[model samples]
Target: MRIVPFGAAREVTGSAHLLLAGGRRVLLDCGMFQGKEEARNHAPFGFDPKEVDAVLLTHAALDHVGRLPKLFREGYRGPVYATRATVLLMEIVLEDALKVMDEPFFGPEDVEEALGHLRPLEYGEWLRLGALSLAFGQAGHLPGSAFVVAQGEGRTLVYSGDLGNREKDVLPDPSLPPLADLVLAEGTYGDRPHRPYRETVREFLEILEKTLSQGGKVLIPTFAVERAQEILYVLYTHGHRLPRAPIYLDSPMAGRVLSLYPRLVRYFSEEVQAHFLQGKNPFRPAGLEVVEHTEASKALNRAPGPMVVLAGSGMLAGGRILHHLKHGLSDPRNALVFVGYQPQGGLGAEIIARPPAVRILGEEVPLRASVHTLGGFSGHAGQDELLDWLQGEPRVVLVHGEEEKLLALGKLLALRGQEVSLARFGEGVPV
Candidate 1:
């Protein structure tokens, strides 16, 4: 088997891995890189899209699955395998992506071409594409997230598509498949241990409670796809005992994503669904509100505090979250909670670093609002969990992390007497 790193070799976004085995070509993921213009455009792929046999999706995050439309536009006429939840979310997510592209560029037809070729598979099912056999396991990163295990010529290669170590809203824990000969794993949090979820949730609530008590609004900026729903689930299920502050869902895209939440009940615990069946809408708790219109969002600035506002573009890199930040950043009474990994050089990272001023919409705003980051909500596994998951002693190939952390995991695994390999961008190794 021949393995090639297409994207996400040195940087963390645009996760694509290519494998050639048994005379078949398989693409592990088609993720898009998110960063400065120069970095984001640096994809190191040199294959004809039509020549590829299939695409195995890890999850539906924009950075992870964002480039499908372009591939489709480029005539990648292969089956795209994903779980039901991923397909459904991709419908919404990809459509949003196409909508964001300016005219004289890609259009809806490109996204339609991609969707028309989608092949949805259930978890734990084995499916065949061309000369390879693929089985998917629950990755636990997001709803319908999965890791692909491919078998050909009596050899198996496992691709850990952004494995989520801990359980979260509407998602199950990671499940390992049959033993792998060559394992491609993600190392997003390989260097650090995440704080316990309970402890992080407690801190998140304590801060929110204090903010509300002071008649201030708590602004939570999160990723629209999974983090937004996760926050709502945590707040509605666990933090309901706090004062009944009105919770406003302020992102238009997030609102559309929330509509899909009801159909995902099968992924959640039975007890969680029971609460919903009993007419208790967790996301739409008694005082929760959905704000969609721009005028409505503008009007929210005048509304009194003692409320909870949730918006997206998790790192405050873009989207409706910026408007809220601009309006509330200078106010000491308000609170800002970030729920995902804020990449270095991002606005969220600047705030996380406690900068004196942050530029928002071309103006510098004093970042006086209390800034809190709950990285415990991260979907990636930490070092210990990765080591534990790799107990089978397969030839581990690390991907999707900073160079330093990836090197650290390689050292850690080597210390355990495990054979490990680190993949570089466009580098191919025989397995």
Candidate 2:
């Protein structure tokens, strides 16, 4: 059997892997590259899409499922397997992606065609297609995220598709994979540990209080899916601790994504479901406003002071957050908080680095607002957590991190007397 890493090798965005065994070609993921690495999406896929047999998806994050339509348009007719909730979330994620990108690689028709190819599979169910047998396990990253286990030709392969933190507030802990010959693991947070979620929440509220007490606005640039919903859940469940201020959810995409929580309550952590059983709606908070229309989003600039604004395009790369930053950054009273990972060279990274000014909407804007980051809110697992999830003595290959992070994790694993290797893009290795 041979394993080839086509994307997310030595970098964090795109995640595609190819497996060749038992005379069949199976693709692990077809994620799209984002930020500075996005141009690679237009490059050739480096393999004949028509020859591929199937695609096993891990989750519905744009980085994991963004290029499904592109694969469909390129003549791949195989089934895309994922959990039922992932399929539903992918519909929203892909539709929102199309609206965000100015020159998207695939069109709405391509998305419709791609959706037709999805074959939903529940956890623990076995799926066999010709030479390959596949199964799904809990990843705990998001509502429908999963880790895939594949077997063929007497050898086993495991793909850790963005493993989740064990201490996550709303998701179940990730399940360990069975013993395998090779393990493809993600090293997103392999270099550091996250602060406890409770401490992070206290700090977040303190920041809000400090800003609101001074009659200033607080801007939260958040991702539309998991991160956005997580913040709203935290605020809704703990509103009494927060200062009395108008909170505005200013992204239409996020508003649509937020509505899925109630319908998919079964996928949430038991604690969240218990609150629901107690007749508590942990999603809808008092003094919360949802902005859907363009005019309503624009009108927020003229709204009163001491407000908490949540906007999309989490990295401040694009969307309504850019406009909010333009209006709010010049004031020292306002505060800008980041609750997710900010990739290197992205707008969020530049701002967090304390740059004097940044180019937004093609104009230089002074960054006068105080900047802060709450690391505990990240969905990915940390260094110790990653080690804990790695159970067996399988040959491990690290992906989905920069050079420094990958090397650090490699050394850490080596110290534990485990054999490890770092994969590079377009590299193929036999196991």
Candidate 3:
């Protein structure tokens, strides 16, 4: 058996892994490169897309499924497999990606064509493509995230597609994958463990409580999918401590994503499932408003505070959050809380760095709002959880992290008497 790292080799953006075994070519994921490496999205996939027999998706985040349209555009017509929830969410994620691309790579027709090829598979179901037999296990990162387990050529391989933080509020804990001979794992947060989600919630509520009591706005720059919904669920679970304030979900993309949550209740944690069973709206806080259009979102800029507004493009790259920041950042009473990772050199990171002023929508705005980043809301597993998941066994090949953290995981795994290999760009690791 052989595995090649076509992308996300030394960075945590695009996540493509090619598994070559038993005279078959299967791709684990075809994620798009983002942030500093986004330009690589237009490069050739490093192999003939048509020659690949199949593609398996890990989840629906832009980095995981964003390039599926390009894949179809490049000549791949084979079936792409994923959980039903992933397929549905991938549709929206890819659509949003297409609309936001400063340089258009693929078209709407390409996205439709890509989505048209998806095939749904439940977790733990055995499926085969020629000689490779495979199953998926819960990755717990999002509503329908999974880790791929493939067995062929007298060997088993596991591909960790961004495993989730243990005991997060919304999703279930990641299921332990079947033991494998060589594991391709993500180490997005391998350098350190995450702060406790409980502590993060406590801090987040404290900020909300403080801002709302002062008749101030709490602006949250959020991702459009699980992060946005996760915040809503967190608010739902902790409304008692918060002051009465309307939450304006300001991204139409997120609104579309939210519509699917109620129907996919089975994909969440047991507590979330119980909330659904009891007819409780785990995602709706008191006076929640879904902002759908540009005029409506602009109206929010002039609206008074004592409100919480969640907007998209969590990195503050380019989204409705910029509009809100343009109007609200100069106000001393308002607060900007970050609930997601901000890429370095991006607007979100600039704001978080307290630059005194920032460029938004071509105008400079003073930075006066209190800034906070609640790190506990992170979706990736911490170093401890990754160690526990691997359990000092399996010949490991690490991917999906920056060099520092990726090597950190490799070092730790080696310390545990496990064989460790680091994935490099377009390099193959043999087993």
Q: Which model scores highest in lDDT?
A: 3
User: In model 1, what lDDT does residue 197 have?
Assistant: 82
Off-target runs (Cα >4 Å) in candidate 3 are none
The CA lDDT of each predicted structure is 0.80, 0.86, 0.88
lDDT of 3 by residue, 1-431 (tens): 89899888888888888888878888888889987788888888888888888899999988888778888998888889999989888988888888888887799989999999899998989888878898889999989999999998888889989899985879999999887888889999889898888888889989989999999999999988888989998888888778998999998988999988987888998989999999987998777899989999999999999999999778877789999999999999999999867777778888888987998998999999899988789989999899999994569989998889988988989988999977888888885
Tens digits of lDDT, candidate 2, 243-295: 78888999788888888878878778889889889987687777888898879
Q: RMSD in angstroms, all models?
A: 2.2, 2.0, 1.6
Question: Of models 1 and 2, which has the larger lDDT?
Answer: 2
Per-model TM-score, in order, reads 0.93, 0.94, 0.96
1-431: candidate 1 lDDT, tens digit per residue:
88898777856887888889878888888877665522453343566778788888878887777777777777788899888888899989888876775331346887888888889887778887657788888777887888888888778888888888564544667786568888888887778878788888889889977999999989988778877877888777756578778888898888898898888766554566777789776665566678879898877777889899888777776777799889899999999988776888778888888888889999999989898888888878888788888886658888888888888888989988888877887788776
Worst 10 residues of 3 by lDDT: 340-349
Question: Which candidate has the top score in TM-score?
Answer: 3
The list of candidate 2 runs beyond 4 A from truth reads: 344-346, 353-368
